[PDB]
RNA sequence: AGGAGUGGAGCCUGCGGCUUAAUUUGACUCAACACGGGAAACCUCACCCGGCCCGGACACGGACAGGAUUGACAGAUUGAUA
């Protein structure tokens, strides 16, 4: 029923992870942005380094790509598969670019659609 | 009974000794010594002098979105576009 951003993001990030995409970390996410292979950016909050977040806003703005501002980067690490080991490990991933469409070539779920619906307004 | 011999010469080969950084070593009566199919330039390769590589699965902990991987130049190689 309800598919708010904070629950469709997990679905879209996972579904991308099965089908490549998901450029994790500031490096290679900046590469996806400059190379213009990106379709969605997920910047995490509570990032101490101001230059980090400011530069990723700059990249997204100039490249005209949507930007999601989630909190608790560790949760982003869970979502993008950085955790592994059941539910242990958990490195922070405070930025991620969803290459080859917001969704992936495997499936086109409506959870992808809610993202663009929320971004249109 | 004899034939061809060889042991003598020079050379080719295997063995010991000597030598050497190293002259890798197995096998000393028949039943070791042109034997290991052993005619070694490299390779072979075991030996000697130098120098790269991990091709140290996997399990458990650290570190980690930057763990870690290549690398052009000049030095340097106390040999090399290592």
Swiss-Prot record:
Name of the encoding gene: RPS12
A Pfam family of this chain: Ribosomal_L7Ae
InterPro entries: Ribosomal_eL30-like_sf, Ribosomal_eL8/eL30/eS12/Gad45, Ribosomal_eS12, Ribosomal_eS12_CS
Keyword terms: Acetylation, Cytoplasm, Nucleus, Ribonucleoprotein, Ribosomal protein
Protein's GO biological process: cytoplasmic translation; maintenance of translational fidelity; positive regulation of canonical Wnt signaling pathway; ribosomal small subunit biogenesis; translation
Organism: Homo sapiens (Human)
Record text on subunit structure and interactions: Part of the small subunit (SSU) processome, composed of more than 70 proteins and the RNA chaperone small nucleolar RNA (snoRNA) U3. Subunit of the 40S ribosomal complex.
PANTHER family: 40S RIBOSOMAL PROTEIN S12
UniProt entry tagged with the keyword S-adenosyl-L-methionine: no
Protein name: Small ribosomal subunit protein eS12
Molecular function as annotated in GO: RNA binding; structural constituent of ribosome
Task performed by this protein: Part of the small subunit (SSU) processome, first precursor of the small eukaryotic ribosomal subunit. During the assembly of the SSU processome in the nucleolus, many ribosome biogenesis factors, an RNA chaperone and ribosomal proteins associate with the nascent pre-rRNA and work in concert to generate RNA folding, modifications, rearrangements and cleavage as well as targeted degradation of pre-ribosomal RNA by the RNA exosome. Subunit of the 40S ribosomal complex.
Localisation: Cytoplasm; Nucleus, Nucleolus
Protein family per UniProt: Belongs to the eukaryotic ribosomal protein eS12 family.
N6-succinyllysine: residues bearing it: 120
Cellular component GO terms held in the UniProt record: cytoplasm; cytosol; cytosolic ribosome; cytosolic small ribosomal subunit; Golgi apparatus; intracellular membrane-bounded organelle; membrane; nucleolus
